Amino acid sequence: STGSATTTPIDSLDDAYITPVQIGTPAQTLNLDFDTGSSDLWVFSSETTASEVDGQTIYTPSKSTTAKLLSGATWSISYGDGSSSSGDVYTDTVSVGGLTVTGQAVESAKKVSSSFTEDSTIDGLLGLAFSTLNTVSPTQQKTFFDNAKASLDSPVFTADLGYHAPGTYNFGFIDTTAYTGSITYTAVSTKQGFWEWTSTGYAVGSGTFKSTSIDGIADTGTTLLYLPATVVSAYWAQVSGAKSSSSVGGYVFPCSATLPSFTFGVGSARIVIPGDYIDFGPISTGSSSCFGGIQSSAGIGINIFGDVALKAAFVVFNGATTPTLGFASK
């Protein structure tokens, strides 16, 4: 089997991407944030505290003939940005782009934090990291990909995120028309539950490539690119007037600037992030100070290749017995 679904930016800044997902019988379609940095599929639901729902589409298990309460099971998750959610668990049929899993754990939110309530476009998350991070207790549950894997033509999914435009998540096959050149594969460590890999270095604009190992995660659920302070300083030093602002919470730059590109290494290959991808616009409406798309990972504890990086590439998440990651230009 295979599946193919279009993923769409939630706003003009590509802050996140939503992908339609069919849950239950008859289908209830919710727009979920596919997140390679977590491993819970959770939804706004009929059980979500009413004051914490503001425009989202909800899953109502009582209207699905295939929903079953997973008795005794609860979940609770906290994300790197400080947001959180928790609730109980159903199993139900879940389909993404024509690919169907029966018996998928669908984590129903009883509580969500402010940032989720305030984002009316995101109806939940679909985690695509390794199932070892799944938070369901007392019986840990598998991700959608993990459940689908055996049935897939090939044990892979791919992320093809757009810059200010729709893109695609594919399951079970590699679309050879979706990228240019060759795909370069690189080793993955699953020790922390993430798609963790080591970049071979970076360049700023037309500058010379610096060979240096940068360990990080491929995370579709993180908006920006978070890298070591040394790397980030070298980038922003090439933008007149750029500075790190404690009050704003990172690097800002004059909105009148033209940003240089940023290149990262994948083995001997290179992925180029155009400068425009690194512009996240005014810090506040009408401001001439703009927020940068490359930020320091210092104090996160991990480097994160988020959407800024990943949308510059066609990315293969290979869930074979020995997992790997592949990157191609497009």
XYZ file of C-alpha atoms in Angstrom, residues 161-319:
159
model
C 7.279 20.941 2.290
C 6.600 24.057 0.257
C 7.865 27.583 0.660
C 4.729 29.708 0.881
C 2.983 26.897 -0.986
C 1.469 23.452 -0.579
C 3.612 20.317 -0.534
C 3.267 16.596 -0.011
C 3.663 13.787 2.503
C 3.979 10.376 0.843
C 3.926 7.004 2.560
C 5.359 3.837 1.141
C 7.124 5.156 -1.950
C 9.652 7.655 -3.202
C 8.318 9.960 -5.935
C 11.278 10.201 -8.301
C 9.664 13.197 -10.070
C 9.629 15.289 -6.886
C 13.359 16.056 -6.624
C 16.355 16.933 -8.750
C 19.672 15.101 -8.839
C 20.215 12.217 -6.445
C 19.095 11.544 -2.878
C 21.946 11.458 -0.352
C 21.360 9.151 2.585
C 22.859 9.630 6.024
C 22.862 7.569 9.246
C 20.226 7.974 11.922
C 20.470 7.442 15.650
C 17.215 6.441 17.303
C 18.718 6.530 20.803
C 16.701 9.617 21.799
C 13.612 8.613 19.810
C 14.192 11.206 17.085
C 15.278 11.217 13.472
C 18.727 12.261 14.683
C 21.553 12.672 12.185
C 24.839 14.522 11.711
C 25.250 17.286 9.172
C 28.742 17.608 7.700
C 28.887 21.395 7.857
C 27.638 24.732 6.578
C 28.222 27.782 4.419
C 26.821 31.314 4.624
C 25.855 32.895 1.312
C 28.601 32.456 -1.263
C 31.135 31.794 1.502
C 33.408 28.800 1.800
C 32.005 25.608 3.267
C 33.034 24.850 6.834
C 33.416 21.133 7.493
C 32.118 20.426 10.975
C 29.832 17.791 12.462
C 26.472 19.151 13.585
C 24.249 16.578 15.315
C 20.557 17.438 15.078
C 17.011 16.228 14.480
C 14.839 16.406 11.368
C 11.682 17.929 12.848
C 8.720 18.905 10.658
C 6.897 20.189 13.742
C 9.439 22.926 14.462
C 9.180 26.083 12.357
C 12.766 27.359 12.435
C 16.336 26.114 12.069
C 18.116 25.959 15.465
C 21.893 25.555 15.324
C 24.929 26.082 17.578
C 25.558 29.656 18.654
C 28.847 29.781 16.693
C 27.105 28.875 13.423
C 24.212 31.270 13.977
C 26.537 34.160 14.854
C 28.517 33.550 11.663
C 25.272 33.717 9.660
C 23.847 36.878 11.177
C 27.222 38.664 11.065
C 26.664 38.819 7.283
C 23.455 40.844 7.657
C 23.934 44.568 8.324
C 22.161 45.590 11.491
C 21.276 42.068 12.648
C 21.504 41.406 16.364
C 20.343 39.052 19.068
C 17.575 40.637 21.099
C 16.838 39.276 24.551
C 13.530 41.167 24.639
C 12.310 39.647 21.376
C 13.776 36.198 22.001
C 16.365 35.763 19.290
C 18.062 37.242 16.258
C 16.303 40.136 14.522
C 17.353 42.053 11.423
C 16.290 45.159 9.540
C 13.304 44.442 7.329
C 15.150 46.336 4.555
C 17.865 43.660 4.411
C 18.499 41.098 1.737
C 19.311 37.853 3.540
C 22.078 35.514 2.373
C 21.387 31.857 1.745
C 22.494 29.154 4.192
C 23.902 25.826 3.043
C 24.037 22.658 5.130
C 25.931 19.461 4.398
C 24.482 16.005 3.972
C 27.468 13.781 3.524
C 29.250 15.171 0.472
C 26.015 16.795 -0.740
C 24.779 20.315 -0.042
C 21.310 21.692 0.572
C 20.853 25.425 -0.029
C 18.247 27.369 1.946
C 17.468 30.570 0.030
C 17.721 33.771 2.012
C 13.995 34.469 1.622
C 13.218 31.253 3.564
C 14.983 32.765 6.582
C 12.686 35.860 6.730
C 9.868 35.522 9.278
C 8.713 39.087 8.949
C 8.048 41.933 11.338
C 8.340 41.087 15.048
C 5.033 42.899 15.518
C 2.586 44.357 13.031
C 4.106 47.388 11.335
C 7.579 46.978 12.816
C 10.692 47.486 10.728
C 12.483 44.843 12.819
C 12.123 41.355 11.321
C 12.530 37.971 12.986
C 15.201 35.570 11.766
C 14.582 31.990 10.677
C 17.942 30.739 11.947
C 18.240 30.848 15.720
C 20.570 29.524 18.401
C 19.932 26.088 19.873
C 21.894 27.015 23.003
C 19.717 26.085 25.941
C 17.384 23.870 23.870
C 19.867 21.070 24.338
C 19.626 19.874 20.756
C 20.046 21.230 17.236
C 16.813 21.208 15.205
C 16.508 21.038 11.437
C 12.996 22.402 11.359
C 10.807 23.534 8.478
C 13.169 26.341 7.354
C 15.745 23.659 6.507
C 13.476 20.816 5.510
C 11.384 22.815 3.024
C 14.537 23.433 1.008
C 14.757 19.663 0.367
C 12.938 16.484 -0.551
C 13.424 14.420 2.610
C 13.174 10.637 2.930
C 12.433 9.187 6.346
C 13.575 5.586 5.894
C 12.100 3.309 8.567
